[PDB]
Amino acid sequence: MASMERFLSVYDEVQAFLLDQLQSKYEIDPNRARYLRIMMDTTCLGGKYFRGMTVVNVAEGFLAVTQHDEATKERILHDACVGGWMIEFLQAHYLVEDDIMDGSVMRRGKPCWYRFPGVTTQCAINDGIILKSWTQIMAWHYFADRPFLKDLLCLFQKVDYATAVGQMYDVTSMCDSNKLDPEVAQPMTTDFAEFTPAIYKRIVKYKTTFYTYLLPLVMGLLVSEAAASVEMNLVERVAHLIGEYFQVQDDVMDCFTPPEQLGKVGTDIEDAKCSWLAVTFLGKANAAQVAEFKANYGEKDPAKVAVVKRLYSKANLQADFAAYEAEVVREVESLIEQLKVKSPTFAESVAVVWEKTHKR
Amino acid sequence: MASMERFLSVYDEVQAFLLDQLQSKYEIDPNRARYLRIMMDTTCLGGKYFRGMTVVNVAEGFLAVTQHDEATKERILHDACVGGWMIEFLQAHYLVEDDIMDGSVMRRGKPCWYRFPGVTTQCAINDGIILKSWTQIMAWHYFADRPFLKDLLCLFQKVDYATAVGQMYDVTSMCDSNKLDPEVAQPMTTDFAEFTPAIYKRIVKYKTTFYTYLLPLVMGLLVSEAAASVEMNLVERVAHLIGEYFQVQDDVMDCFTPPEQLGKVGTDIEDAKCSWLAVTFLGKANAAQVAEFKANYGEKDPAKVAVVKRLYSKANLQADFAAYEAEVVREVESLIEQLKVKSPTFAESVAVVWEKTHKR
Ligand SMILES: c1ccc(CCNc2nc3ccccc3[nH]2)cc1
Ligand SMILES: c1ccc(CCNc2nc3ccccc3[nH]2)cc1
Ligand SMILES: [Zn+2]
Ligand SMILES: [Zn+2]
Questions:
Q1: DSSP type of residue A214
Q2: Helices then strands (H, E): number in chain A?
Q3: Which region is the signal sequence (chains A, B) (predicted)?
């Protein structure tokens, strides 16, 4: 609430710093500075800020229980907000480049950036590059003298690289692994043997969890100088868990949430994605339902897509979701409890992160 | 010669490290590891290695005049080769993403990566992301304990960001600055007021010089722990100079070097680029020649392109090139001499870099 104002306010500072620096050090002209400003705003702003605000909230938790001078509280909260924007700008990179890669139309109820008339794909691929370069420029500027700079940079790169590896897993999820080959055009799988829970879990862990949950939680710990206050294997395990559930929810929404509320027309079925819905359906389907899914999945035709959605509706996937969800609730609660051994306040931040995901 | 073997040999190590790490830590499967291997080879190998080998040569120069244990000579040369591959992989990122951005057909006498049948644009944009992420993973792995890690990472990011800003300057070079606007489709300039030597110099400095010459020279100094042995403003000035000349040469080749030798059909004229040829032509053209260039530049039509090439041939741009070249030779020689005040060996490495550029 008040946390948000500080958080959203640090955007203006960061932007001024970056745009001012472009003028004083990179010979930018006013008109290109404006184009960048607009790019930054369009691509960084207008989501939920779940990732950035997680950094802020984790730091606020340690601030309530740790003795510091006022000026030191302000420095830590500023660092948390910069760190959170590093994550939001990394998210912006991903979304610009993915929207190009997938040929997407809308994002956040507006056209994808590459579709803006004065952008185009030739400028947008590089605008996405710039978005990620800005994360580094922010980090070296604001955190130059900080004891956590090294750990923060190393964590960020590992997380970015995991994320790119997860994009590869995602875009290749409807190919047969044994047929991947740069020299040969890739056909869609016909057996769907690789639509399994373990393979789905690998996709979602790399493409989503490391940067949506692991990174915000650990960055909050690092800006607070509190990483030795937690059991890092537990932080990982809980991030894994909550991130998977987050994505399962997005998978179900793609198919069943109205376009206006989603902020886009979902096309996971036409795109033959290894979604939770597809994997769960195949987990319980009879021989006839499997052959009907195969006849219809991964085609642009609305009739075939509606046959897929029928199959899902008829298979009572709501119940497998409640079973899955209950199991997630067991495990996240167990992990929060184990997190209390070394840190009550960090476990509570995790509890709050879980509540915000479970209830979105 | 022998420098090259070590250099090219470190590729195999780096690749094994990266692919092995993908298996042990990122849950990669054999088939995706193979796809990545092939991607790495296709996009990183088969150029001249001018950038990577510059790091190696600068380190070899200091090695001849500096007392070290044998094991320490080997460690420094290994670091130079890793650092040089960091640059080559950053080059690979650029070339993959630019070839997509510009719709290019061939690169290094083979199809651009995105055109390979089992790649496509949807995989290639992310393959390019991975290429740049590999630079960071190499750096944190090989240079974890090194005193120069911080300086090296900070230099690399600043150089990457300058480079992305230069790509923006390049792709927007045929627009009027005052008309840039994400909301409005961009028309080509009609006045060509912004085809000037200063504006050309800004483009080439950011898009080429910082990563082709500044970065290899300074990385050679950093792996050698020799940066306090040079005057850094001179290193910058000489990098600027030689990099500009390198690009002017590429600009002339785009128009006049046969496709088979170039390894591509040049399209700078159709693409309305602010090339050295266009800026130099407009610098000396009469009113009629200016109006004929305007009628014909930045169009796909071979007849119009051949009218542009005619205009260039007839304007005796060979002579403006020799005048420019002579001026470059003056200034590079002056700078090499000034570089001798603090370091004879570094000045010689610069002399050799200049010879390799001037004579390519
Ligand atoms: C280039 C490299 C890597 C990526 C993976 C991004 N992963 C991702 N994007 C998401 C959007 C919304 C919700 C969950 C998400 N997980 C994209 C582009
Ligand atoms: C994304 C971001 C930045 C870039 C600029 C690359 N600059 C460049 N590429 C070159 C190739 C050959 C010779 C000189 C060059 N300068 C590209 C893609
Ligand atoms: Zn995607
Ligand atoms: Zn280009």
A1: I
A2: 15, 2
A3: none
C-alpha to C-alpha distance for A158 and A19, rounded to whole angstroms: 28
Report CA A19 to chain centroid distance, whole Å: 26
> How far is ligand 3, taken at its centre, from the CA of residue B3, in Å?
42
Helix axes A30-44, A2-25, angle to 10 degrees: 150
Closest CA to A10 of A95, A77, A93, A73: A77
* Token pair 């179900």 in the structure block, residue: A252
Contact at CB, B178 and A31, closer than 8 angstroms? yes
Evaluate whether A96 touches A127 at the Cβ level (below 8 Å).
Answer: yes
Binding residue per annotation — B254? yes
Would you say A231 and A72 are in contact if contact means Cβ atoms under 8 Å apart? no
What are A68's two structure tokens? 């510091």
Strand, helix or coil for residue A266:
coil
Tokens matching residue A89: 């700008």
**Structure tokens that stand for A317 in this block:** 């996937």
**Separation of alpha carbons A167 and A179, rounded Å:** 18
Method used to obtain the model:
X-ray
Query: At how many Å resolution was this determined?
Result: 1.5
Q: What's the rounded Cα separation, in Å, for the pair B336 and B351?
A: 7
Calculate the CA A5 to chain-centre distance: 22
**Domain spans, chain B:** 1-360
Rounded distance, CA A143 to CA A148, Å? 8
Nearest to A165 among B26, B153, B167 (CB): B26
Strands B110-111 and A106-107: unpaired
Pocket of ligand 1 (CB under 6 A): A 94, 97-98, 163-164, 166-167, 207-208, 250; B 126, 129
The two structure tokens encoding residue B18: 């990266």
Paired tokens of B255: 């128009």
Is A52:A200 a contact under the CB 8 Å cutoff?
no
Is B145 strand, coil or helix?
coil
Residue B105: what are its φ and ψ, rounded to 5°? -100, -50
Query: Residue whose CA is closest, atom 10 of ligand 1?
Result: A208
CA–CA gap between residue B29 and residue A297 (Å, rounded): 25
Of the residues A36, A180, A183, A206, the best mutation for testing chain B's interface (the one with the most B CB atoms within 10 Å of its CB) is: A180
Class in CATH terms, A1-360: mainly alpha
- Measured in angstroms, how far is the CA atom of residue B168 from the centroid of ligand 4? 9
Q: What sign does the CA torsion over A198, A200, A203, A208 have?
A: negative
Give dist(CA B351, CA B353) in Å, integer: 6
> What CA–CA distance (Å, rounded) separates B250 from A76?
49
Write the burial class of residue A238 (CB in 10 Å: 0-12 exposed, 13-18 middle, 19+ buried). buried
